[PDB]
């Protein structure tokens, strides 16, 4: 029986961007 | 003989979000 | 015997948020 | 014997929107 | 007996809006 | 009867970003 | 007996656009 | 009798534009 | 006759974001 | 009797781009 | 003959955003 | 007689650019 | 007589990126 | 033989936006 | 004779970058 | 004679992210 | 003999991040 | 045997944008 190929699951989202400095005092 | 049918790929993940920017140091 | 098909994959998880800013 | 056919995944939801920034305190 | 197929899923709901800003 | 797999419903959108401070008085 | 085939979901709508910002008050 | 298939849905309409800004 | 399921139409786009204040006189 | 198979919807168009901002008046 | 439904063509992209004022002299 | 299938639609054209800014 | 099956359209291309802004003149 | 229609290839991405002036000396 | 199916199209190329800024 | 069925194209990759801006020189 | 179908391609890898800024 | 065409894998994401200058001292 020539069975059907499995698909591949989506890849996880990357990290969010990291915050920068607050005020310049 | 009748063949099997393959699946398609999963959608890649939405990325994380920006961390809020730093407080007073 | 006649064959059986495959199943589709699922979307990946959405990423974790970034690290919060610095001081000074 | 003829097999059934599988369905695909639903699209993930669009995120909410930015809340407007604060008034005079 | 010959089989019956599956049904597809639906898109997820769009998120609620973020909380509005602070004072001072 | 080799019946077909159900799909999975999309995932809900995340929260919107929360507003930041208004004016710097 | 041969089964019917189901359809897929419609794509969700693109959102409206930003209204231009206020004039002199 | 042998069955008949379904039809696909259409994309939703694009939203109306936001309300324009305030004065003062 | 095991007929095929109808799909569901896409959802309308949300409102656009509303403009904020013009100049600070 | 064997039925015909339906097609899917076309993708909605990418929007136009921002016109450049005005010169000296 | 139960013929197959035609699909619908994608919708045209909206206008681009219009430029705002240049310098404040 | 056995039926014939349909054909898919095409993506819509990308919009024209916006009008350029004002003076004064 | 059994008919052939049609294909779907290709995805439109991601646009180019912003050229960096000019140096000292 | 009622053969299947060919699909159409995606369209090329437009140009990137062109940079604007550097510093105002 | 029984028919043969079609083939799908490919994604379009990604655009070239924009022209770099001016002087003065 | 029954024909084989073709596959569809893979989704193009999400681009890299912006490198953080330079430190004090 | 009756034919066998093809398999679908996978999404391309996400690009590497850009180079970090200059000094002076 | 009129076998089915292979699909083509997605294309790699482009580079991320490169950071610009830090502070103007």
Residue numbers in the entry:
A (entry chain J), B (entry chain O), D (entry chain N), F (entry chain I), G (entry chain C), I (entry chain B), ...: 6 to 30
C (entry chain E), E (entry chain D), H (entry chain A), L (entry chain H), O (entry chain G), Q (entry chain F): 7 to 30
What are the paper's exact sentences on this?
One of the of most well-studied defense collagens is complement component 1q (C1q) found in mammalian serum. A key feature of C1q is its “bouquet” structure, containing six flower-like C-terminal globular domains, an intermediate “branching” collagen-like region, and an N-terminal “stem” where the collagen-like portions bundle together. We have recently recapitulated the unique C1q octadecameric structure in a series of short (∼40 amino acids) synthetic peptides derived from the native sequence of the C1q stem region. Here we use a peptide self-assembly system to design collagenous assemblies based on the C1q collagen-like region.
We next attempted to introduce some asymmetry into our structure by increasing the length of peptide B by including 6 more amino acids at its C-terminus from the full length sequence of C1q30 so it could more easily be identified in the density map. This new peptide we call C1q-B ″carrot-top” peptide (B-Crt). Following this, we were able to use this narrow region model as a starting point to build a model for the full C1q collagenous bundle. The full structure of the C1q cys crt assembly revealed a hollow elongated assembly, ∼ 100 Å long and ∼30–50 Å wide depending on the region of the structure. Top-down views of the map revealed the octadecameric nature of the assembly with six copies of the triple helices. At the N-terminal base of the structure there are spokes extending out of the structure, but these were at too low a resolution to resolve the individual chains. Past the spokes the structure is quite narrow and subsequently widens toward the top as shown in Figure 2c. At the narrowest part the three peptide chains in each PPII trimer are nearly parallel to one another and untwisted. As the structure gets wider toward the C-termini, the peptides wrap around each other with a right-handed twist as expected for a canonical collagen triple helix.
